[PDB]
RNA sequence: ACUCUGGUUUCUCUUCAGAUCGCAUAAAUCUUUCGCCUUUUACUAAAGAUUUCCGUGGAGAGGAACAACUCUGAGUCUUAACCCAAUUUUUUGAGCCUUGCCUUGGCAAGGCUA
RNA sequence: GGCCUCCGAACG
């Protein structure tokens, strides 16, 4: 009905947990109906590796959780 | 040996007369005239010496009463009607030949 | 119709990018193409696979389904997709 | 807030006991002393006052000085439209059609004074009977009414859908019918054609460049040798500048230097000039109300195709198959050739700046409803040398006050002379042109 | 949408084919659907151990595709 | 003070990011660049005002006055062209979903001015031609298609005022098809008649053409058409929509069958029923229908307006709704990047065609320039007056190499050659200007492949100078010149009428020769100072 | 499809308008040039800077008149006939074994499946 | 091929 639950989340630190245990945390800039993410300098959790913007698929995608508030 | 300076013309038919009238009065020998299609617009080419050209645009919209929209460049040459170093060339220094 | 992230997929063709299928090989190269449905046709490759052995080819395309994620530069941080 | 008083009790009672003077008036006289002492409440308020002949009403509400002593009239000029515009104009045309009819004319003139007594207080039977005179525009096809209900008016909507819905003027409004029957009376009346070149190397830009290099036009305004005092030259200079042996082709065409400021180098200082042509358009012009839409000027196509070229993919498998029309393939469903004068709106689509305006703002009818000037701007020979002579004096007297610009600089605050109602002064009341007039012709007697 | 995949700078070019579970097979491209099915002439199937066989004209779902390679400039 | 017009000291503009357009412009091949001009004084300016307008976020209302940028040019601009043609640049997305940087820069119509609109146009590898659709082709569209055939450079046909000449002049749609490709059949005509090879195939299915109105601001192709056609209904149809957009065809009522051959009772043509048919109908829409069919036609077209927005007047609400419908920018990005080649694509033959010394070092050097990065060589384009008359910026093509504030380069003449340079100097920019609407970027170093304006280069820049590495790269610096494509007629000698004027005569000859490297100034034998131009 | 939000004309006062022209815009003063002139007011016609009239525009505040008319941005804005999913998510296939690391728990890697 | 400054009232 207000459908804000994933608009309320843009911006904030988010931090992904993938279907294969991975982690990403990026800044949460946009979303769609395909749970396409795009992440803004985004960090790979497992050892850390620098990624940057990436854009995962909703297909991997399990849960997400608040990190922290906008840089 | 000098250039011929090409102007097409926009204007009526009666603007169109007139802007042959002013080529005559020029001594123009013009290029070609059309009757522009797509609206009923006279565009009409002229062949011209670029010595007679000079206030060609500024007369021309002038008798056409705000018509008669035209443009020219330097196309070619002209061969002059005949050689220089003539004796009785010189007549009078404000009577055109 | 589409997406913002699609939409920003679409801005991105032309740049570097890499690219890992759901098997794990890691594709690096300008983004030739780019459809609705993720479909990346890209030029010279370097690909990484899980051992760590690499090697170079020329041209490849990925089906959309099968791609776990892409990484962009990040000149296209900034906008036009920017909104609060 | 200021209400109106009974028109006759303040009128007639106050100009009834003004000019008796003798011990009633004695203590006004110095009121008198200060009505007299104000020129521009009667000259402002008469000249404001115009009923005009267009239309036959009475005037507004005026301020009449509670000692008796004089009154003001504040209207705002209100002026309508362009309807109006065509309304005024369209009393001239009938001022001609009535013109070219009654073989015997009037006397008219008749400043009726003969010395002074002419003290009248006929104003009572101006409002015993009435002439009901002037109007007499019955012209329309069932398509003005609605401006023919508005063409006497002192507020020509008074509340409506489309109109100014003030109390005097504010943003004009008005439909399509609207600017149809103003372009037909407007019309009827002088109007001009398309701009293009026509109106421009004449006037405005141009008369500023003529009047900056100070030469002489075919025909037109003169002003002045401006920067040059008398005569500057040199034996040297000339020597250096001209030849005595020259090309010679053109007697040097002052309208090609005019243009031209590099043709003339002769003071090129302070000239603003250099308008290069025009857009050079097409305007079709309009026809009797048939149709088509299209009114089917000359154009002969180079034989439509003739063996020239064609697209590409003649393929009816891909064809057929490459659409699916699940939707109307047009847009809407209508008949865009003569629907709602469709003729009479495309030809609006090119209309002079009062009729291009649509719906209006606002505008001055006791300053500037006149658009004569542009239509006697470059006339043709058909007038006399005096009425020729005539016509560059108004192009000279337009030309003076267009190239005057103006310092558009601050003002200190307006509404001074209404402003003036705060304390006890005067009271306002509906008056008309008679009444009001004539108590101002008491009030200088 | 519908949209399908725009192949038509592969067709008739010799491809290398990734499958799902370390399956690789060669072929050249003779049409595709919507669908992301392939027509493969002379598809020749990558063993893991190494050793070629040629199994002709075959169809290969989109399913099970990783990725399509290109052996030829398109 | 009152100087002549101000190009710089304006905001930003709106979705638009230094760093991202820039890095974008400067990094990606998508970058392009190219000029309008075809007919002369046939609404060029307009376009960019359209395009400007649509960037910018504050732009000037058509209603109030031009939407051009005000003090430009002051009478010379307000009286017709003026500018000898200016650059600009803007990033403009594309109907593909994907933005590009685009650079255009105004031409002239007059002859002269078109001559050095030439000059200015052969630094970017492509052109396009702005004809109106009421007198077609002009001398200049004939002209220009001319200098462009033997420059070997790719122009795209672009209508201009179309609703305006059909809308003026009530055409139906039939003259309307059939006049519009009469006029395309002239263009390809002409471009098939000039020389070398026919593949340019002009034509409205090619996407070569773009039809737009500068009345009410509307522009649109084939591709835009079928884009906005098929995003209102049937979207599964893009490609092969536009390519049986119009053709030879008529609509049969299988649903869609389109008939190649015979009139099938349907329409004289395809585009005119369904392209033609909304088109006008949305034009007739307004004037008569305005009012009246308001609520009709703009809740079927889905725009909407404010009471007094809809109110406000013919021609603010026709465009305003083109704005709403047609505004989009579709067919000018994508018939752009389809057309324009790349900027190594179309490098290559430029670069083979301008500069003197071909092959190794030379070509390659500018090969390798492409993509990556150039070895520091700047063949420019020309220089243009800055906001004080005292000095002049260097708005110039950058061939190779990123250059760098204050870096020196070696600058060399006309007649100077890689051989023996006798006008080769060394000099330092100031500054990286880049011109945008009607401001400007200043940049430290900016990348190869971007034309951009540079200061520090005055008096040793003439006319049109290639600039080169200071650590002496061989192997054919200095351009070779653009040519004007006509011939120096009027001479007009201006002697000063104080004697001791004379020196600035002299400097202000060099300065004014320099900004308009067209005219020609000679001194003659016996002393004079005697000027030639077209 | 529910709820909170809740409007138009006119009259005054206080600020801003060297403005894209406050569309067809008047008059005065002074420094001079000039016109005719027997001294002055008036006055012939050009420049510059100093201004007033008719106006006019933007913002804020205070009033009455049908105001109870309607707009407003948002707020979780709770619905059944019929045929359908082989690239994005409700018709979609994972697990086991072995080795190494970790205090174990657990993690990483390879292999096995049918 | 055209251009047409003119323009009076008191006092003294």
């Given at each position: 009905?207000?459908?804000?639950?994933?608009?309320?989340?843009?911006?904030?630190?988010?931090?992904?947990?993938?279907?294969?245990?991975?982690?990403?945390?990026?800044?949460?800039?946009?979303?769609?109906?395909?749970?396409?993410?795009?992440?803004?300098?985004?960090?790979?959790?497992?050892?850390?590796?620098?990624?940057?913007?990436?854009?995962?698929?909703?297909?991997?995608?399990?849960?997400?959780?608040?990190?922290?508030?906008?840089? | 040996?000098?250039?011929?300076?090409?102007?097409?013309?926009?204007?009526?038919?009666?603007?169109?007369?007139?802007?042959?009238?002013?080529?005559?009065?020029?001594?123009?020998?013009?290029?070609?005239?059309?009757?522009?299609?797509?609206?009923?617009?006279?565009?009409?080419?002229?062949?011209?010496?670029?010595?007679?050209?000079?206030?060609?645009?500024?007369?021309?919209?002038?008798?056409?009463?705000?018509?008669?929209?035209?443009?020219?460049?330097?196309?070619?040459?002209?061969?002059?009607?005949?050689?220089?170093?003539?004796?009785?060339?010189?007549?009078?220094?404000?009577?055109?030949? | 119709?589409?997406?913002?992230?699609?939409?920003?997929?679409?801005?991105?063709?032309?740049?570097?990018?890499?690219?890992?299928?759901?098997?794990?090989?890691?594709?690096?190269?300008?983004?030739?193409?780019?459809?609705?449905?993720?479909?990346?046709?890209?030029?010279?490759?370097?690909?990484?696979?899980?051992?760590?052995?690499?090697?170079?080819?020329?041209?490849?395309?990925?089906?959309?389904?099968?791609?776990?994620?892409?990484?962009?530069?990040?000149?296209?941080?900034?906008?036009?997709?920017?909104?609060? | 807030?200021?209400?109106?008083?009974?028109?006759?009790?303040?009128?007639?009672?106050?100009?009834?006991?003004?000019?008796?003077?003798?011990?009633?008036?004695?203590?006004?006289?110095?009121?008198?002393?200060?009505?007299?002492?104000?020129?521009?409440?009667?000259?402002?308020?008469?000249?404001?006052?115009?009923?005009?002949?267009?239309?036959?009403?009475?005037?507004?509400?005026?301020?009449?000085?509670?000692?008796?002593?004089?009154?003001?009239?504040?209207?705002?000029?209100?002026?309508?439209?362009?309807?109006?515009?065509?309304?005024?104009?369209?009393?001239?045309?009938?001022?001609?059609?009535?013109?070219?009819?009654?073989?015997?004319?009037?006397?008219?003139?008749?400043?009726?004074?003969?010395?002074?007594?002419?003290?009248?207080?006929?104003?009572?039977?101006?409002?015993?009977?009435?002439?009901?005179?002037?109007?007499?525009?019955?012209?329309?096809?069932?398509?003005?009414?609605?401006?023919?209900?508005?063409?006497?008016?002192?507020?020509?909507?008074?509340?409506?859908?489309?109109?100014?819905?003030?109390?005097?003027?504010?943003?004009?409004?008005?439909?399509?019918?609207?600017?149809?029957?103003?372009?037909?009376?407007?019309?009827?009346?002088?109007?001009?054609?398309?701009?293009?070149?026509?109106?421009?190397?004449?006037?405005?830009?141009?008369?500023?460049?003529?009047?900056?290099?100070?030469?002489?036009?075919?025909?037109?305004?003169?002003?002045?040798?401006?920067?040059?005092?008398?005569?500057?030259?040199?034996?040297?200079?000339?020597?250096?500048?001209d030849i005595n042996k020259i090309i010679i082709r053109q007697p040097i065409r002052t309208e090609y230097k005019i243009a031209f400021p590099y043709?003339?180098?002769?003071?090129?200082?302070?000239?603003?000039?250099?308008?290069?042509?025009?857009?050079?358009?097409?305007?079709?012009?309009?026809?009797?109300?048939?149709?088509?839409?299209?009114?089917?000027?000359?154009?002969?196509?180079?034989?439509?195709?003739?063996?020239?070229?064609?697209?590409?993919?003649?393929?009816?498998?891909?064809?057929?198959?490459?659409?699916?029309?699940?939707?109307?393939?047009?847009?809407?469903?209508?008949?865009?050739?003569?629907?709602?004068?469709?003729?009479?709106?495309?030809?609006?689509?090119?209309?002079?700046?009062?009729?291009?305006?649509?719906?209006?703002?606002?505008?001055?009818?006791?300053?500037?409803?006149?658009?004569?000037?542009?239509?006697?701007?470059?006339?043709?020979?058909?007038?006399?040398?005096?009425?020729?002579?005539?016509?560059?004096?108004?192009?000279?007297?337009?030309?003076?006050?267009?190239?005057?610009?103006?310092?558009?600089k601050a003002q200190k605050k307006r509404y001074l002379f209404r402003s003036f109602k705060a304390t006890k002064f005067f009271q306002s009341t509906?008056?008309?042109?008679?009444?009001?007039?004539?108590?101002?012709?008491?009030?200088?007697? | 949408?519908?949209?399908?995949?725009?192949?038509?700078?592969?067709?008739?070019?010799?491809?290398?084919?990734?499958?799902?579970?370390?399956?690789?097979?060669?072929?050249?491209?003779?049409?595709?659907?919507?669908?992301?099915?392939?027509?493969?002439?002379?598809?020749?199937?990558?063993?893991?151990?190494?050793?070629?066989?040629?199994?002709?004209?075959?169809?290969?779902?989109?399913?099970?595709?990783?990725?399509?390679?290109?052996?030829?400039?398109? | 003070?009152?100087?002549?017009?101000?190009?710089?000291?304006?905001?930003?503009?709106?979705?638009?990011?230094?760093?991202?357009?820039?890095?974008?412009?400067?990094?990606?091949?998508?970058?392009?660049?190219?000029?309008?001009?075809?007919?002369?004084?046939?609404?060029?300016?307009?376009?960019?005002?359209?395009?400007?307008?649509?960037?910018?976020?504050?732009?000037?209302?058509?209603?109030?006055?031009?939407?051009?940028?005000?003090?430009?040019?002051?009478?010379?601009?307000?009286?017709?062209?003026?500018?000898?043609?200016?650059?600009?640049?803007?990033?403009?997305?594309?109907?593909?979903?994907?933005?590009?940087?685009?650079?255009?820069?105004?031409?002239?119509?007059?002859?002269?001015?078109?001559?050095?609109?030439?000059?200015?146009?052969?630094?970017?590898?492509?052109?396009?031609?702005?004809?109106?659709?009421?007198?077609?082709?002009?001398?200049?569209?004939?002209?220009?298609?001319?200098?462009?055939?033997?420059?070997?450079?790719?122009?795209?046909?672009?209508?201009?005022?179309?609703?305006?000449?059909?809308?003026?002049?009530?055409?139906?749609?039939?003259?309307?098809?059939?006049?519009?490709?009469?006029?395309?059949?002239?263009?390809?005509?002409?471009?098939?008649?000039?020389?070398?090879?026919?593949?340019?195939?002009?034509?409205?299915?090619?996407?070569?053409?773009?039809?737009?109105?500068?009345?009410?601001?509307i522009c649109f192709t084939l591709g835009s058409f079928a884009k906005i056609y098929a995003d209102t209904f049937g979207d599964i149809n893009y490609?092969?929509?536009?390519?049986?957009?119009?053709?030879?065809?008529?609509?049969?009522?299988?649903?869609?069958?389109?008939?190649?051959?015979?009139?099938?009772?349907?329409?004289?043509?395809?585009?005119?029923?369904?392209?033609?048919?909304?088109?006008?109908?949305?034009?007739?829409?307004?004037?008569?229908?305005?009012?009246?069919?308001?609520?009709?036609?703009?809740?079927?077209?889905?725009?909407?307006?404010?009471?007094?927005?809809?109110?406000?007047?013919?021609?603010?609400?026709?465009?305003?709704?083109?704005?709403?419908?047609?505004?989009?920018?579709?067919?000018?990005?994508?018939?752009?990047?389809?057309?324009?080649?790349?900027?190594?694509?179309?490098?290559?033959?430029?670069?083979?065609?301008?500069?003197?010394?071909?092959?190794?070092?030379?070509?390659?050097?500018?090969?390798?320039?492409?993509?990556?990065?150039?070895?520091?060589?700047?063949?420019?384009?020309?220089?243009?007056?800055?906001?004080?008359?005292?000095?002049?910026?260097?708005?110039?093509?950058?061939?190779?190499?990123?250059?760098?504030?204050?870096?020196?380069?070696?600058?060399?003449?006309?007649?100077?050659?890689?051989?023996?340079?006798?006008?080769?100097?060394?000099?330092?920019?100031?500054?990286?200007?880049?011109?945008?609407?009607?401001?400007?970027?200043?940049?430290?170093?900016?990348?190869?492949?971007?034309?951009?304006?540079?200061?520090?280069?005055?008096?040793?820049?003439?006319?049109?100078?290639?600039?080169?590495?200071?650590?002496?790269?061989?192997?054919?610096?200095?351009?070779?010149?653009?040519?004007?494509?006509?011939?120096?007629?009027?001479?007009?000698?201006?002697?000063?009428?104080?004697?001791?004027?004379?020196?600035?005569?002299?400097?202000?000859?060099?300065?004014?020769?320099?900004?308009?490297?067209?005219?020609?100034?000679?001194?003659?034998?016996?002393?004079?100072?005697?000027?030639?131009?077209?």
């Open positions: 009905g207000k459908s804000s639950k994933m608009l309320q989340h843009i911006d904030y630190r988010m931090r992904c947990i993938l279907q294969d245990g991975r982690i990403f945390i990026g800044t949460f800039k946009a979303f769609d109906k395909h749970m396409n993410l795009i992440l803004c300098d985004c960090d790979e959790f497992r050892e850390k590796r620098v990624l940057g913007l990436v854009l995962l698929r909703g297909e991997n995608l399990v849960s997400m959780t608040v990190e922290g508030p906008p840089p | 040996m000098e250039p011929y300076y090409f102007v097409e013309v926009q204007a009526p038919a009666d603007c169109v007369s007139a802007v042959y009238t002013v080529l005559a009065r020029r001594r123009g020998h013009v290029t070609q005239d059309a009757p522009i299609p797509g609206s009923p617009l006279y565009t009409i080419k002229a062949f011209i010496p670029a010595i007679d050209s000079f206030g060609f645009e500024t007369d021309l919209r002038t008798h056409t009463q705000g018509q008669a929209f035209s443009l020219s460049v330097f196309h070619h040459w002209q061969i002059v009607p005949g050689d220089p170093l003539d004796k009785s060339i010189v007549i009078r220094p404000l009577e055109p030949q | 119709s589409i997406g913002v992230p699609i939409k920003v997929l679409h801005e991105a063709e032309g740049h570097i990018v890499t690219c890992e299928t759901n098997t794990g090989e890691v594709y690096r190269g300008k983004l030739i193409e780019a459809e609705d449905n993720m479909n990346c046709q890209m030029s010279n490759i370097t690909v990484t696979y899980r051992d760590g052995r690499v090697a170079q080819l020329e041209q490849v395309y990925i089906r959309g389904s099968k791609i776990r994620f892409l990484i962009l530069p990040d000149m296209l941080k900034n906008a036009p997709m920017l909104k609060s | 807030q200021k209400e109106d008083m009974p028109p006759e009790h303040v009128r007639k009672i106050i100009r009834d006991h003004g000019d008796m003077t003798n011990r009633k008036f004695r203590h006004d006289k110095r009121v008198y002393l200060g009505a007299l002492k104000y020129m521009p409440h009667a000259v402002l308020k008469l000249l404001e006052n115009m009923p005009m002949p267009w239309e036959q009403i009475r005037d507004v509400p005026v301020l009449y000085h509670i000692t008796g002593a004089i009154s003001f009239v504040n209207e705002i000029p209100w002026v309508i439209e362009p309807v109006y515009i065509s309304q005024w104009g369209s009393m001239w045309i009938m001022m001609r059609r009535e013109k070219r009819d009654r073989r015997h004319f009037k006397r008219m003139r008749f400043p009726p004074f003969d010395d002074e007594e002419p003290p009248l207080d006929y104003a009572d039977n101006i409002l015993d009977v009435e002439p009901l005179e002037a109007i007499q525009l019955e012209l329309d096809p069932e398509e003005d009414a609605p401006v023919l209900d508005w063409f006497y008016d002192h507020q020509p909507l008074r509340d409506s859908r489309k109109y100014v819905n003030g109390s005097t003027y504010q943003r004009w409004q008005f439909t399509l019918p609207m600017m149809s029957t103003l372009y037909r009376l407007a019309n009827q009346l002088l109007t001009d054609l398309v701009d293009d070149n026509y109106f421009y190397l004449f006037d405005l830009k141009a008369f500023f460049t003529s009047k900056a290099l100070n030469m002489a036009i075919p025909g037109g305004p003169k002003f002045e040798p401006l920067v040059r005092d008398i005569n500057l030259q040199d034996e040297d200079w000339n020597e250096f500048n043709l003339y180098n002769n003071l090129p200082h302070h000239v603003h000039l250099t308008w290069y042509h025009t857009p050079n358009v097409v305007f079709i012009k309009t026809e009797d109300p048939d149709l088509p839409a299209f009114y089917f000027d000359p154009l002969i196509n180079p034989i439509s195709h003739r063996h020239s070229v064609k697209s590409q993919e003649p393929l009816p498998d891909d064809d057929e198959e490459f659409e699916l029309p699940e939707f109307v393939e047009p847009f809407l469903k209508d008949t865009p050739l003569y629907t709602d004068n469709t003729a009479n709106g495309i030809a609006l689509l090119w209309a002079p700046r009062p009729f291009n305006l649509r719906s209006g703002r606002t505008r001055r009818a006791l300053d500037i409803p006149l658009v004569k000037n542009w239509y006697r701007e470059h006339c043709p020979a058909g007038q006399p040398v005096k009425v020729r002579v005539s016509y560059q004096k108004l192009l000279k007297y337009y030309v003076l006050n267009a190239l005057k610009h103006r310092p558009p509906k008056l008309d042109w008679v009444e009001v007039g004539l108590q101002v012709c008491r009030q200088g007697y | 949408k519908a949209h399908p995949p725009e192949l038509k700078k592969f067709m008739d070019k010799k491809l290398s084919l990734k499958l799902n579970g370390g399956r690789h097979v060669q072929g050249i491209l003779r049409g595709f659907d919507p669908f992301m099915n392939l027509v493969i002439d002379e598809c020749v199937e990558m063993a893991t151990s190494g050793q070629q066989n040629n199994i002709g004209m075959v169809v290969i779902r989109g399913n099970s595709i990783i990725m399509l390679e290109a052996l030829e400039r398109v | 003070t009152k100087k002549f017009t101000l190009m710089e000291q304006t905001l930003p503009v709106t979705v638009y990011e230094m760093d991202f357009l820039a890095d974008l412009m400067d990094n990606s091949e998508l970058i392009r660049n190219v000029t309008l001009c075809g007919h002369l004084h046939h609404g060029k300016t307009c376009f960019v005002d359209c395009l400007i307008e649509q960037t910018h976020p504050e732009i000037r209302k058509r209603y109030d006055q031009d939407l051009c940028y005000t003090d430009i040019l002051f009478t010379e601009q307000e009286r017709g062209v003026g500018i000898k043609s200016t650059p600009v640049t803007v990033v403009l997305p594309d109907t593909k979903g994907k933005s590009y940087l685009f650079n255009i820069m105004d031409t002239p119509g007059h002859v002269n001015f078109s001559d050095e609109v030439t000059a200015g146009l052969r630094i970017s590898d492509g052109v396009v031609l702005f004809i109106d659709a009421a007198e077609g082709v002009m001398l200049n569209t004939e002209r220009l298609i001319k200098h462009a055939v033997q420059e070997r450079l790719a122009v795209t046909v672009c209508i201009n005022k179309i609703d305006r000449l059909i809308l003026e002049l009530k055409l139906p749609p039939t003259d309307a098809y059939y006049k519009l490709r009469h006029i395309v059949d002239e263009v390809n005509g002409l471009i098939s008649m000039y020389s070398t090879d026919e593949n340019l195939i002009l034509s409205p299915l090619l996407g070569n053409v773009c039809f737009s109105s500068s009345q009410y601001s490609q092969e929509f536009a390519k049986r957009l119009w053709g030879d065809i008529y609509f049969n009522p299988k649903t869609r069958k389109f008939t190649k051959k015979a009139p099938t009772s349907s329409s004289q043509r395809s585009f005119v029923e369904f392209i033609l048919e909304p088109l006008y109908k949305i034009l007739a829409q307004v004037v008569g229908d305005v009012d009246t069919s308001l609520p009709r036609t703009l809740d079927e077209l889905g725009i909407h307006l404010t009471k007094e927005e809809l109110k406000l007047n013919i021609r603010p609400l026709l465009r305003l709704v083109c704005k709403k419908f047609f505004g989009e920018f579709t067919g000018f990005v994508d018939m752009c990047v389809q057309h324009i080649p790349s900027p190594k694509v179309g490098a290559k033959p430029k670069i083979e065609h301008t500069y003197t010394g071909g092959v190794d070092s030379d070509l390659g050097e500018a090969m390798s320039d492409c993509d990556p990065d150039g070895p520091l060589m700047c063949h420019t384009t020309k220089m243009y007056s800055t906001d004080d008359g005292v000095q002049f910026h260097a708005f110039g093509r950058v061939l190779s190499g990123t250059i760098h504030a204050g870096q020196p380069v070696k600058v060399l003449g006309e007649n100077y050659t890689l051989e023996d340079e006798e006008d080769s100097q060394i000099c330092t920019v100031g500054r990286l200007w880049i011109s945008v609407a009607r401001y400007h970027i200043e940049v430290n170093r900016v990348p190869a492949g971007n034309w951009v304006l540079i200061e520090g280069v005055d008096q040793p820049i003439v006319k049109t100078a290639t600039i080169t590495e200071p650590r002496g790269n061989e192997e054919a610096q200095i351009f070779r010149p653009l040519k004007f494509n006509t011939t120096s007629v009027i001479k007009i000698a201006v002697e000063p009428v104080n004697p001791s004027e004379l020196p600035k005569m002299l400097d202000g000859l060099r300065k004014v020769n320099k900004s308009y490297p067209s005219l020609t100034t000679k001194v003659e034998e016996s002393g004079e100072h005697v000027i030639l131009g077209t």
